[PDB]
Amino acid sequence: EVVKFMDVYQRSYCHPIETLVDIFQEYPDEIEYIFKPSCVPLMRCGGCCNDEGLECVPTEESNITMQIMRIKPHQGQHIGEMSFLQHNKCECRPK
Amino acid sequence: EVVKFMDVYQRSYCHPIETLVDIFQEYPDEIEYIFKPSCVPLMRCGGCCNDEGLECVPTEESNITMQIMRIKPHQGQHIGEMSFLQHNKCECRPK
Amino acid sequence: QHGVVYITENKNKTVVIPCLGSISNLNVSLCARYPEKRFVPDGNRISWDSKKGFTIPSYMISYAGMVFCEAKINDESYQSIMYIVVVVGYRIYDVVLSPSHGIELSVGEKLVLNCTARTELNVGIDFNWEYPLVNRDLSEMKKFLSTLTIDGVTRSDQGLYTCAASSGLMTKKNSTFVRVHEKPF
Amino acid sequence: QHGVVYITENKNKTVVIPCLGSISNLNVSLCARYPEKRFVPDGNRISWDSKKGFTIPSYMISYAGMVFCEAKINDESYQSIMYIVVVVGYRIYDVVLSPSHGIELSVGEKLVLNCTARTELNVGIDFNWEYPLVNRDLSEMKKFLSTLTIDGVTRSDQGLYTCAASSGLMTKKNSTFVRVHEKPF
């Protein structure tokens, strides 16, 4: 039950990794509503670079769409489509 | 290409999700060495709760072991086993 | 095809999912998600009535995302539609904009007014201003901020400034008077 | 079974993976990870010599995690072992502990001394103190901090205090004198 080396390497390099993101992290102004679910799974550039002076940044982005329940407390609700940004290609780059 | 509702729900609830964690985030004192790879994939409590007043916390933890290269700049290196903390069971709890 | 079930911040109330059935005595329970739990009558607090539905006090499920009743009937098991659990608040403890005290300004001088509402949790908040702008969310207590901003301030902007916050079924407001003086001398 | 290859912070140097082969003229390249790239001679900058190995200037790969040479030979393709790329630094721009100026203290008064080293990147740092404690990492410039701490400070602790930082092949130090006075009056 001990992970190999070159496994940890590839399992860890700057690449699109699924991430749980708060909706209000994406739509900070919508403070009048509340959302269920309150967060969403999105590919974001994750993992590390092989050099201090680098940073794991996206080189390809694409919004994606999911069904969220918008709720205006004491006035109603409904389930609408919300678009969210995603990373497709990641890249280590100078900082 | 639009995600269902109850899918987003379950794909997003407070549960152990694989996470890329910086080693120096775990071993902040080891400033004399440098590690390759410099980060590691670890299950950590991720996702959201169904109530403002909750928080997604672990209820079961377990260190796991991986092969990392410790490097003492200009004095040597080697590949040793490093243990890292993991979350096994997650739970929404009062804050 | 799903249902919806609201809950107040002051829990410990009692709730009824309309799991309505004919058989006066069924082994009917209430499964939940999430996390996957499954509740059963006990007379005291919990119960399911044939024509009333499944009963349970709010705080017993306020953490879940959706519940549904399910009946074990021999061959297969049959269940109701999904009801979505929704906790909501309304309590606005106070609203106060910085600064509270008066304001004497000079023409052209940038003006920034922070309006701050402290609410309980699961509160949604709408801001509304009265006067001659951007807002964001931030203990069992929330804080929303609404910041009004003007740069080129004229002499006419020298009016009373009003922020009001509505939580849905409640509303509070605070104010402050500001005067726009002409560059002195 | 793997190899290792170091690189300085001042890149634009030239490096040689010992991909040693017999055939004076092979279609040999240098594949990389990560990200998966694959380099080829061009005479000018890049080259592979039969008995010298694969050649390339540092900054061309300093981003990768491991490289290896590979030769296409008809049926199957054969490759060298894995060499691990490792960027390292040594430049310690300065070390200075807060405060720089002298210190007059009182017995029993808590003492905290921040020691701060600014280095280039990929630098590892060891701290060493001289005198009669915890440290952590924090532009193309790193900053490591080493904080010495004493609470119950006696009169004897009234010595010179020395922090020194070694990056491996370099070292700098700064100091400050502190006096421990007895509670006055």
Curated annotation (Swiss-Prot), chains A, B:
Tissue expr: Higher expression in pituitary tumors than the pituitary gland.
Domain of life: Eukaryota
Disulfide bonds: C14-C56, C45-C90, C49-C92
Induction behaviour: By hypoxia. Regulated by growth factors, cytokines, gonadotropins, nitric oxide, hypoglycemia and oncogenic mutations.
Glycosylation sites: N63
Family to which this protein belongs: Belongs to the PDGF/VEGF growth factor family.
Associated disorder: Microvascular complications of diabetes 1: Pathological conditions that develop in numerous tissues and organs as a consequence of diabetes mellitus. They include diabetic retinopathy, diabetic nephropathy leading to end-stage renal disease, and diabetic neuropathy. Diabetic retinopathy remains the major cause of new-onset blindness among diabetic adults. It is characterized by vascular permeability and increased tissue ischemia and angiogenesis.
Protein name: Vascular endothelial growth factor A, long form
Organism: Homo sapiens
Region of the whole protein represented: 219 to 313 of 395
From Swiss-Prot, chains C, D:
Coverage span on the entire protein: 132 to 329 of 1356
Family, per entry: Belongs to the protein kinase superfamily. Tyr protein kinase family. CSF-1/PDGF receptor subfamily.
Annotated glycan sites: N12, N27, N114, N174
Tissues expressed in: Detected in cornea (at protein level). Widely expressed.
The species this protein was found in: Homo sapiens
Cell compartments where the protein resides: Cell junction; Endoplasmic reticulum; Cell membrane
Record remark on domains: The second and third Ig-like C2-type (immunoglobulin-like) domains are sufficient for VEGFC binding.
Protein name: Vascular endothelial growth factor receptor 2
Role this protein plays: Tyrosine-protein kinase that acts as a cell-surface receptor for VEGFA, VEGFC and VEGFD. Plays an essential role in the regulation of angiogenesis, vascular development, vascular permeability, and embryonic hematopoiesis. Promotes proliferation, survival, migration and differentiation of endothelial cells. Promotes reorganization of the actin cytoskeleton. Isoforms lacking a transmembrane domain, such as isoform 2 and isoform 3, may function as decoy receptors for VEGFA, VEGFC and/or VEGFD.
